[PDB]
Amino acid sequence: PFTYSIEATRNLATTERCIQDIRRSTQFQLAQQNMLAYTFGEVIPGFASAGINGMDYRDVIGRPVENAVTEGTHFFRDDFRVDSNAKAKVAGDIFEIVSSAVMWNCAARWNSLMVGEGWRSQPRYSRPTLSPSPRRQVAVLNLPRSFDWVSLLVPESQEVIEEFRAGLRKDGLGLPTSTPDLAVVVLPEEFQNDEMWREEIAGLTRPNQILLSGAYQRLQGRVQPGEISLAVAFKRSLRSDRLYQPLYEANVMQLLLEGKLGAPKVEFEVHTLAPEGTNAFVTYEAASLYGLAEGRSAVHRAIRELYVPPTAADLARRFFAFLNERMELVNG
Amino acid sequence: PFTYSIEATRNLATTERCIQDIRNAPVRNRSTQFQLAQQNMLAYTFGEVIPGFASAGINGMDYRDVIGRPVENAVTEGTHFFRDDFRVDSNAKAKVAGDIFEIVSSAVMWNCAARWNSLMVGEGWRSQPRYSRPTLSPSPRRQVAVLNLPRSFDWVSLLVPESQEVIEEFRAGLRKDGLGLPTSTPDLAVVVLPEEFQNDEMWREEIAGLTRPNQILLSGAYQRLQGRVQPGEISLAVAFKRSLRSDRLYQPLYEANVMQLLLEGKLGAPKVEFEVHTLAPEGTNAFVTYEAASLYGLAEGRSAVHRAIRELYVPPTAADLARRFFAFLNERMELVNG
DNA sequence: AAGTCCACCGGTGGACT
DNA sequence: AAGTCCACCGGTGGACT
Ligand SMILES: [Ca+2]
Ligand SMILES: [Ca+2]
Ligand SMILES: [Ca+2]
Ligand SMILES: [Ca+2]
Ligand SMILES: [Ca+2]
Ligand SMILES: [Ca+2]
Secondary structure, eight states: OOSOOHHHHHTSOGGGOSSOOOOOOOOSOOOHHHHHHHHHTTOOTTSSOHHHHHSBHHHHHHHHHHHHHHHHHHHHGGGOOOOHHHHHHHHHHHHHHHHHHHHHHHHHHHHHHHTTSOOOOSSOOOOOOSOOOGGGOEEEEEOOTTOOGGGGBOHHHHHHHHHHHHHHHTTTOBOOOOOOSEEEEEOOGGGTTOGGGGOOOSSOOHHHHHHHHHTHHHHTTOBOGGGEEEEEEEOSBOOGGGGHHHHHHHHHHIIIIIIITOOOOOOEEEEOSBOOSSHHHHHTTBBOHHHHHSSSSOOOBSSOOEEOOSBHHHHHHHHHHHHHHHGGGSOO | OOSOOHHHHHHSOGGGOSSOOOOOOOOOSSOOOSOOOHHHHHHHHHTTOOTTSSOHHHHTSOHHHHHTHHHHHHHHHHHHHHGGGOOOOHHHHHHHHHHHHHHHHHHHHHHHHHHHHHHHTTSOOOOSSOOOOOOSOOOGGGOEEEEEOOTTOOGGGGBOHHHHHHHHHHHHHHHTTTOBOOOOOOSEEEEEOOGGGTTOGGGTOOOSOOOHHHHHHHHHHHHHHTTOBOGGGEEEEEEEOSBOOGGGSHHHHHHHHHHHIIIIIITOOOOOOEEEEOSBOOSSHHHHHTTBBOHHHHHHTOSOOOBSSSOEEOOSSHHHHHHHHHHHHHHHGGGSOO
16 A cells, blocks of 8 residues: 555565565685685694794684685675674684694604604604603594594493493483593504504695594594593683583593593693683683592592693694603503 | 786875775774664563563464564664664674573563462462462462572572581682682572561562563562572572574583582582573484483482483473473472471 | 673584485 | 584673773
């Protein structure tokens, strides 16, 4: 009608409406795997030029989205547009994938020394002092979406845990396990002469991406409860509500690995580039609840540290020093 | 030059640039252009309506639609006044939709508590709308307070000082070892009404709408109760999450665990009831996650281990939300002597 | 008072069917 | 393949200063 009317409008057939609709809604996809291959095809931060190794880690992790934005602008001009939720999702995966690659190369360089091939000198990092041994080799495992960390355990340990859950599921309870982003594990005895674990990679090409992202498959059902040496959760920035998955999961890991399988203190740390204030530091001082609730065990922190890598080299240095220390707990 | 050059462009004086910014845009930390004024939206949309205590049409409507109505009205106003210029980020809608889900639902529970309290002090059972009359023996010591808790809150501050000292002395022990056990907060706490307030009419009045004074009454209520609740008088804790993601399940799971360690473990309280409300579970993932046993209960090793989170609840309508809460009170408040 | 903190969640790329 | 599931985080309104 001349004066607008909701009733009249609601009564029109679809094809009689004044506006005809002729249209996920995403327009330009951030191809994150392509982005890694492009920006980090030939660079693993902390193992490249002193410039990249020493650079503000936030700038490094941010480079691929920046390069992708520049690419998009070139090809699509003033039509180019991506949602902040895209950038957010990709930036996070990139933070995780890249740091896990730094750690992979530290692991390779450390394995190469454990096995008696000496200590690679480029770039220069202080030579670990621990006495070398094939049995002190480690694997860095970037764990996939949907993983259950329990699947790393030798089958006998899964049974122990499974039985324990049975008792619970019978009464409507359970104790699901999810997953940290990453786990470093002592390399299984059977793999200790395999060459692959000692080779540093040149960059995140697609083949190398697959290598790092699928390495967990090779160790599934092979790790002793005590041989899970470090768990890491990466969160590129924090918010107060986003802190708890790693805190909770570390608690569950300590309960099962320390409590039910008698393993040493489980080391679980969080990495972020933007703690956005200081409360997360207080939050992650929380004592491990299992250790508290029962009396037999010395109580320690669920999360050992909230770490803010300044540079890629500092991340590399910190892992090395951790290995140099944590691996002493393993007979050579 | 004919072929675009980044350096030539850099060298351009600002008055020589090809694009001339003429916005006169005030430079700020944030790039927001229109704010969703959430307290204003609550007032406009629910000024005269508390869902579950309004019209048959509202009480029985899909609760997703009720909760989504303030943002929808807001978008209407916005496109009316600002036409093509009106844009807000999905992140603004997420923030405001979240707070609205929690504030609205907490207001439904406030009205329930009032109607409940009215019955408990012997003033009978209201009928508009119609809810099943409670079978539990009325008593003024079975009144409850619904507390929408503030951002930054620490739930331990509700507890009577005698109980807070136990906790602090426990934490002091932990600190000598370089440990802590911080506590955060659930969105909402239902607590037994302290004696001193059991004759206060303000706990028996139902509110007509979320006008700004009512918003403030509800959101400020916790202050009145700070330091006056016994450990075992914390009857229900609720976290509201309008939708779920697998990574966003854990604050309430963790906090419920901490509440149970301290309240049940250290203060002898009975099972701590703690539940999540969502309108969008996105699968069965979270229902499995929340079957998790209370970690405290386990590790120590006594019988009758229970879940940390009692239930993941998905409110079909506001009416159902009220019914459930009434049903809960009816069963839970029998643990309290008349 | 501009700035900082707090806690809100929805749109995303890739794995999987 | 057409769809669902997973787990990523940054922009936000209001409190507090
Ligand atoms: Ca991963
Ligand atoms: Ca899974
Ligand atoms: Ca992560
Ligand atoms: Ca609140
Ligand atoms: Ca606080
Ligand atoms: Ca909430």
